[PDB]
Amino acid sequence: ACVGDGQRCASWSGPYCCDGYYCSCRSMPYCRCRNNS
Numbered sequence: 001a002c003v004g005d006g007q008r009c010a011s012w013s014g015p016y017c018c019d020g021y022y023c024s025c026r027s028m029p030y031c032r033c034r035n036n037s
Contacts, residue, residue: 003033 002018025031
C-alpha cells in the first residue's frame with residue numbers, strides 16, 4: 001500500500017510513495033508525500 005497525494009510520510013521518513021509520487025521535507029519534520037510534478 002502506498003500513500004495518496006499530499007499525505008505526509010510516516011514519522012519523518014519511513015514508508016515510500018505510490019508509483020510516481022515523491023516525499024518532500026520542507027521546513028518541518030512531518031515530510032509530505034504527493035505527485036511528482
